[PDB]
């Protein structure tokens, strides 16, 4: 069981973890410390209704929200791309397949990292300075009230797997090396890498999660839920076009949504 081949998989897990720490300053451990109220450095303010929203103040509306959250996500996309450079074999793939892998993968990784910011009560905002409640978000007028609730539904179940940053480093690498993306030119060298990452993930979860039989399968099922969240955005855009009701939104709420995804 401990042999040259398993040692190589442990080495790959550590290489990915080290690169993950270098690439992503916003770790899961950091997010959870704030959520469970462990960090006494300027604790986050809770925004749970319109009155607290106003006390928290420190070209359709929805389209502007999406333009703004995509702009605020540029740094995350850059961090993800830097991380992908550290995955052995990735930079040797055809450049167009590297771009294709990242253009679909970044959205799923952003949602994975957004889950770290979420619990059943709400989500961290304003660089950890604020906490926006789930039920306040859900209470807002259509179509805005429906934006975030399926991501909370995903995050609560995802967080119950109790993955740590060591796990997440390999899981995110597996997401990037998805051989089933549309428009990929050479699928086999991608699959070759992903199969090695999958072996490394399998071993990592056995060593790190004695409590969870079928955790490997359950985590692979989550990749299915991530893709569905992304494709639900197309439907959300259609709901916005169709919407024949007032879609005005408080500017502070617009600002909060631009911090989400």
């Amino acid at each position: 069981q401990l042999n040259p081949e398993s040692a190589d998989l442990r080495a790959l897990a550590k290489h990915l973890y080290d690169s993950y720490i270098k690439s992503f300053p916003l770790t899961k451990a950091k997010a959870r410390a704030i959520l469970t109220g462990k960090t006494t450095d300027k604790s986050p303010f809770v925004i749970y209704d319109m009155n607290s929203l106003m006390m928290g103040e420190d070209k359709e509306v929805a389209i502007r929200i999406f333009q703004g959250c995509q702009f605020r996500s540029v740094e995350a996309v850059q961090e993800i791309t830097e991380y992908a450079k550290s995955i052995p074999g990735f930079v040797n793939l055809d450049l167009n397949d590297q771009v294709t892998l990242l253009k679909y993968g970044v959205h799923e990784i952003i949602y994975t990292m957004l889950a770290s910011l979420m619990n059943k009560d709400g989500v961290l905002i304003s660089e950890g300075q604020g906490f926006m409640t789930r039920e306040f978000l859900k209470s807002l007028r259509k179509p805005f009230g429906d934006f975030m609730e399926p991501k909370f539904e995903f995050a609560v179940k995802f967080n119950a797997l109790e993955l740590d940053d060591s796990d997440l480093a390999i899981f995110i690498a597996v997401i990037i090396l998805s051989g089933d993306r549309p428009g990929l030119l050479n699928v086999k060298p991608i699959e070759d890498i992903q199969d090695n990452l999958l072996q490394a993930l399998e071993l990592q979860l056995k060593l790190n999660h004695p409590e969870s039989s079928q955790l490997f399968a359950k985590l692979l099922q989550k990749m299915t839920d991530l893709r569905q969240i992304v494709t639900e955005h197309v439907q959300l855009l259609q709901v916005i076009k169709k919407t024949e009701t007032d879609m005005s939104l408080h500017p502070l709420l617009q600002e909060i949504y631009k911090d989400l995804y």
């Binding site: 791309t81 990242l102 253009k103």
Partner: peptide
């Protein structure tokens, strides 16, 4: 998104 592909292509440089 062509803009997103642009950001990725430059970060890959």
């Amino acid at each position: 998104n062509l803009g997103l592909e642009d950001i990725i292509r430059k970060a890959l440089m």
